[PDB]
Structure 1
Amino acid sequence: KQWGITPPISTAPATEQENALNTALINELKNQNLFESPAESEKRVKVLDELQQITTEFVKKVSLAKHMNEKMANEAGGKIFTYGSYRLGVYGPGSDIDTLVVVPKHVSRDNFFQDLEPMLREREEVTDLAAVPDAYVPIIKFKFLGISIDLIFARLSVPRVPRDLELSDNNLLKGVEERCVLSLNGTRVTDQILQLVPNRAVFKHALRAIKFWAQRRAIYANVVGFPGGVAWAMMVARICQLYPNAVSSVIVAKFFRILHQWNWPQPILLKPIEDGPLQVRIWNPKLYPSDKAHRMPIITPAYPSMCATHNITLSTQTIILREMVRAGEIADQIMVKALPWSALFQKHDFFHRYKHYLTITAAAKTAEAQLKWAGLVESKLRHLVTRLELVDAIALAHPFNKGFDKVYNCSSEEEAQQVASGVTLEVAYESTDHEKLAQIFPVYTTTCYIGLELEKKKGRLDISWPTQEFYELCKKWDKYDDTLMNVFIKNTKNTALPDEVFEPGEER
């Protein structure tokens, strides 16, 4: 069989040395503690079975509440799906479970918040329940027995959602709101990624390596213009198709070279782009100028096909390709036993590569608002880098979204507003992390960075208006409380970088 839309590059089996290196790669992954215990694996299956049970109870309640007869409420059904990194089977310890609840026609999005959310708060196993009703996609986040869940809603047009319902039928997209079809896409894409690889076990191991490399190099974030988890998976899936009989160590070594030499902006396709019954746009750079603008397009296989990497800016494209060339050189040294596998997962050098950094800090006086506020500021970083690209002096803006959390203990309430406004003065602070509590004057800050690459002379660095534009966008937030939340930007030279961004064994 031929996998993918292109004849393979090689169908040779794994050699003797590539099997030994494949074992040493899998061992390196275990040594980094990237696998959870089989206990917590069973625990996630237990939580999904509970949620599936709550789903049947939730749909039956809404059915009976709308005066449907008892027989049809039992037939009403409802099914829990999973997508993202859990459905792929490559997730770290403590990672979330992207979950989809699919309901029949008579179950409204109001029932998702006014009936299902009261059901989850009623249960003892659920903590940290936080529903955002004013989001573009309806989502409810909560911990079930300590396992973080992200639950999105999706109403169909079928009178009943049976338990054996597969989402492969494109006709099930008929008559559902264009909100709800994108929520179906998360599962339909993930199900198809597993169907299109020739070897699922080789794919999962290869993805776990590539994912860990991207996270260690801090190029694993679609919020700031890098490929997201779905994007990296479709990339690793493409190489599996091109080497259908290879082991994981081969897939990884060929992954970096094939992708930085790829003829961009030619898209990465796992299968031919489908047609469908809906009258909605499919990704076509020949028809839509916005699709034409995508620089490194990775196209999802589920109809309707879209570009998972539309956020990729000019800077972030340059950085993805730089990192692939770097990792390609390390991998080829690993495959000739010149280097161990641990070298491939050497952490980023973001705080050593530039002479000019931007410090972006979101501050709030209370820890509850700092969680919401620091997430708003992070979502506007991708616009700052694209705005900084429009500066003549700036050739590249490197976004670093691993926030650094501090808590400043000030004496006067005026000093609280003074440090929240950017005047650090000489106040004592302590480092913390995003695990919160739910004359003490607290100020909680989250610090991101943007590394600047200046243009070189052929034949003056003023970011005042991009900085001020950034403040207005953060403060246009519908939940911006001018009493608690603040945000400021500082020009930071490499020598003035704080000790927080360096580990004990690093230089400055």
Structure 2
Amino acid sequence: SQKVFGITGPVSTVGATAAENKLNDSLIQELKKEGSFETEQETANRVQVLKILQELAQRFVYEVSKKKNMSDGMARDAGGKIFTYGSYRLGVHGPGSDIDTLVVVPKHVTREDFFTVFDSLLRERKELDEIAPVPDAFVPIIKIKFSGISIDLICARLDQPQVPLSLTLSDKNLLRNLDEKDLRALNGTRVTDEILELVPKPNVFRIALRAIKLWAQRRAVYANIFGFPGGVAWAMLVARICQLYPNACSAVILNRFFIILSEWNWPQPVILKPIEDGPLQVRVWNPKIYAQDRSHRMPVITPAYPSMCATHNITESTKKVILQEFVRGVQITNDIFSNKKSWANLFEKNDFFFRYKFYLEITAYTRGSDEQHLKWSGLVESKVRLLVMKLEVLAGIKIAHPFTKPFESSYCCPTEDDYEMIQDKYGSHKTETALNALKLVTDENKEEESIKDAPKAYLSTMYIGLDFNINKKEKVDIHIPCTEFVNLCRSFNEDYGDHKVFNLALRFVKGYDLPDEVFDENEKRPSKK
């Protein structure tokens, strides 16, 4: 009831002034200019797509229930229901945004049914242009594009005979007798549903969140895999501030959001309500019981039972960046509120590739199918974080800052020799021009009877910016951490040791000698100081 004001009640209950609303109006307007919002039309399409999927979910269940020899009535009554979660469910999605979707089915519908029956029902539709089923994923999923709109579909199987249209997923007992995959599948929806019910004024929250997502992206502090808060974390952080200021407008919320998160007594958790127990043998976030939990540095806790920490990955170095960025938020928003800066300023692109003197490139190379490369580089990427952690503990390392995005390229690679060379010359601007000799495969140039044919080599590169501690005279030695990292890129139940195909290289590089790929059309690379 008072749940909407969070665990300490409001900080202030005073509503917005006119001067505040004007600055809110210009925010929404900046958000519009920046293309946060899709038109009413493309939202209308989204709604219609889910309708069709809702119809198909009901059909799916109906058909399976007929196969188990229920009557017509019982098959209909068995129901089946579509829920959204993540960005779309929250009202913060953008023009290109995927809809994260969950199909809920009664006890007698398996996921083997989902990957056969539901799959073939999807294939029947004219609106279906692409479908990628991935049964053996950590969460089993079907990725589709439907009427140009991207949908991610997951399946949850309840311990219940029927899933009526009226079903909401908020009751704890919906979790009884579920296996871990099903348990996991329910969580996304229950979490985002609860955030929505834990917020005083949802439209105010929606706008504040749109602002935070843009900022986080542009300031390069949005990437879970690399040790920054992802979407749900940011959503919950924004939700927390909304509770402290129930009547504030979004402009004000952003202001108070940067001040409070920058003065937060970190590692004390941000929580949207008191963490709860339940009847199940499932791990709840609990720093008292679990050493892992205790080591979280900026914990942001999901509210749906099993409460979990949505920022496990944050490292000492990423917390430093996040905190700098909040402190920057504090100065810019106060300036906006003083008529001295615009919102455009807050959303100014980061300058990661100008801010340090040295960088550590980490490159995954593949000479093979792009499916092989996806796998190989996906593996390498997931460890970058672990490298950050080994480096950041070292005496001479002031910070190890991972950038939040890989740099992808690919070349036609007719021979083994071309492949040695790509490996040799790539990554330094001194030698980078050597690979113009090899046709650079372009997002805009993929003539299938020429380019999309030749044996191709793929590169993915992550960058860690470095700051050293140096009034001391010595060679800074970081080979152990780099070597340990390499050995972490270990072939689990698949092999990457055939260097004729996969490779891994790290390279230490001075700022001025950074690869071109790293600078935009409008950026001029730095030079020898």
Give the structure-1-normalised TM-score.
0.93
Q: Aligned equivalents of 1:39 and 1:371: distance in 2?
A: 34
Aligned CA distance change for structure 1 residues 122 and 375 (closer, same or farther; 3 Å): farther
Q: Aligned equivalents of 2:174 and 2:370: distance in 1?
A: 43
Aligned-residue identity in percent:
56
1:361 counterpart SS class? strand
Structure 1 residue 450: Cα displacement: 1.0
In the alignment, what sits opposite 1:299?
301
2:155 counterpart SS class? strand
Aligned CA distance change for structure 1 residues 109 and 250 (closer, same or farther; 3 Å): same
1:41 counterpart SS class? helix
Determine which of 189, 193, 196 is the counterpart of 1:194. Answer: 196
8 Å contact from structure 1 (residues 369, 484) kept in 2: no
Show the 5 A alignment for 1:26-425.
Answer: 26-365=28-367, 366-410=369-413, 412-419=414-421, 421-424=423-426
Q: Aligned equivalents of 1:92 and 1:448: distance in 2?
A: 26
In the alignment, what sits opposite 1:463?
478
In the alignment, what sits opposite 1:489?
506
2:129 counterpart SS class? strand
Determine which of 440, 458, 467 is the counterpart of 1:453. Answer: 467
Structure 1 residue 433: Cα displacement: 5.2
Structure 1 residue 45: Cα displacement: 1.2
Letter in 2 for 1:400: F
Q: Aligned equivalents of 2:445 and 2:169: distance in 1?
A: 36
In the alignment, what sits opposite 1:444?
458
Structure 1 residue 419: Cα displacement: 4.4
Letter in 2 for 1:469: E
Q: Aligned equivalents of 1:391 and 1:494: distance in 2?
A: 22
Q: Aligned equivalents of 1:72 and 1:54: distance in 2?
A: 17
Aligned CA distance change for structure 1 residues 362 and 121 (closer, same or farther; 3 Å): farther
Aligned CA distance change for structure 1 residues 168 and 465 (closer, same or farther; 3 Å): same
8 Å contact from structure 2 (residues 226, 402) kept in 1: yes
Aligned CA distance change for structure 1 residues 345 and 231 (closer, same or farther; 3 Å): same
Q: Aligned equivalents of 1:6 and 1:97: distance in 2?
A: 34
Structure 1 residue 374: Cα displacement: 3.1
8 Å contact from structure 1 (residues 416, 441) kept in 2: no
Judge which range, 62-71 or 427-436, deviates more.
427-436
Q: Aligned equivalents of 2:453 and 2:226: distance in 1?
A: 38
Letter in 1 for 2:372: A
Q: Aligned equivalents of 1:364 and 1:50: distance in 2?
A: 40
Structure 1 residue 17: Cα displacement: 0.8
1:99-127 CA-partner distances (Å, limit 9, x unpaired): 11111111122222233233334434323
Aligned CA distance change for structure 1 residues 418 and 124 (closer, same or farther; 3 Å): farther
Q: Aligned equivalents of 2:127 and 2:393: distance in 1?
A: 50
Judge which range, 190-199 or 375-384, deviates more.
375-384
Give the structure-2-normalised TM-score.
0.90
Structure 1 residue 354: Cα displacement: 1.1
How many residues in Structure 1 have an aligned counterpart in Structure 2?
507
8 Å contact from structure 2 (residues 392, 398) kept in 1: yes
Unpaired runs of 5+ residues, structure 2, are: none
Aligned CA distance change for structure 1 residues 419 and 434 (closer, same or farther; 3 Å): farther
Judge which range, 243-252 or 361-370, deviates more.
361-370
8 Å contact from structure 1 (residues 393, 461) kept in 2: yes
Determine which of 413, 417, 427 is the counterpart of 2:435. Answer: 427
Structure 1 residue 455: Cα displacement: 3.0
8 Å contact from structure 2 (residues 219, 349) kept in 1: yes
Structure 1 residue 88: Cα displacement: 0.4
Judge which range, 268-277 or 452-461, deviates more.
452-461
In the alignment, what sits opposite 1:500?
517
1:112-158 CA-partner distances (Å, limit 9, x unpaired): 22332333344343233222222222122121122111112211101
Aligned CA distance change for structure 1 residues 448 and 121 (closer, same or farther; 3 Å): farther
8 Å contact from structure 2 (residues 410, 459) kept in 1: yes
1:415-468 CA-partner distances (Å, limit 9, x unpaired): 343245454361215474599889945323222211112234569333334333
8 Å contact from structure 1 (residues 404, 447) kept in 2: yes
1:427 counterpart SS class? helix
